[PDB]
Amino acid sequence: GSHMLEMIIKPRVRGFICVTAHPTGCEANVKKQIDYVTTEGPIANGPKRVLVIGASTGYGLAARITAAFGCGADTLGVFFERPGEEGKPGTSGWYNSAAFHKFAAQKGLYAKSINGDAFSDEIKQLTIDAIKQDLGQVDQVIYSLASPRRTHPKTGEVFNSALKPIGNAVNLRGLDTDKEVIKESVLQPATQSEIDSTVAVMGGEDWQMWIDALLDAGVLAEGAQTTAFTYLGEKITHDIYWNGSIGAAKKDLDQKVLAIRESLAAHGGGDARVSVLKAVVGQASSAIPMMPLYLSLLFKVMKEKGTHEGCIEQVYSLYKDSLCGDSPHMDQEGRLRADYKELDPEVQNQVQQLWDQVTNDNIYQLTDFVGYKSEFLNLFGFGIDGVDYDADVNPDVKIPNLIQG
């Protein structure tokens, strides 16, 4: 009985985390993103050898798809995901990457991946080894890691990021997606240890270590380009994000990009940019219970303007308009901006007005909580058109050219 080794996979939510993922739906979700890119069409003058650090979900996956299927790039991806086992579905990023390798091969594109802690020196060395064997050098490095923790590669100290305001405590309104209630909670201000730790995790040091490793090992091409992703948002999120602990980390990136640009700009006119992207649903949205509410409002407002987008739409335009084209959406500290439609004054004014009106009773009248919930499930391969969720699947989906760290 093959059925002994297969199962019907359904969403299982433990609080705010979906702990299952559907391999067929994840494949279909990747193909939907690829098909968006191929439908919008190729991007000229892009990189042809791309390293994506954090390439398995979210914005890093979108960059990997954009580079490969938009720019025709060979792509080496680094991520940290759990393979499937019998009776135990792997993480969505595992299945996403399996699909990516499948579709890349179909198009005659190289796809190799490294599964392991990108903060460590060993993973950096495995990545260098892979570039040397296969690509010689890479033309572009996407830095798209998101983690709540970082094990320092030298000291071994384990840093945990904090998601707190700075200075004063703040009352943050939010949406509990389990209870489906609007709820306010008071977050205490970050300690200095919490700030320093968040800067260590989501700051720019590891990005810098990556680039200096590739340079020292000589696998960074003359003039190569590198970008790290960031979020600024608008006032509604300023207290906890931009001006809070995680914002102190993102502020470390506007400093680090300058030293990185210095090194690349001497290397055949390469370039480096912090790239600012819009808010989207991700696996850990509810890491701030404010974000499900903000997203539900933002979605409705932007859908009414025809400007709602997800990861792949955002990153495709980042590549076509700014990383490769001559509409480089530059701002005053030299950041590439793709988030301008979210920050539109009238959008933010409308989101603000609705923020003050939303209650337990009018959530579905005032917000796109429906859309938030659907896009959340889509991350894990659920709710996808054309998938037969009644069919058995083997959760142990394997990936060729997957280097296990």
Ligand SMILES: NC(=O)C1=CN([C@@H]2O[C@H](COP(=O)(O)OP(=O)(O)OC[C@H]3O[C@@H](n4cnc5c(N)ncnc54)[C@H](O)[C@@H]3O)[C@@H](O)[C@H]2O)C=CC1
């Ligand atoms: N709304 C959003 O989610 C926004 C996110 N951003 C930025 O985009 C970047 C990606 O964020 P998301 O797409 O939200 O996250 P994500 O959770 O979807 O993916 C994070 C990636 O990092 C990888 N990763 C995590 N820890 C790792 C480790 N120790 N070693 C190797 N790989 C590891 C994961 O496998 C995955 O590939 C971040 O810099 C984030 O600040 C920017 C704007 C908005």
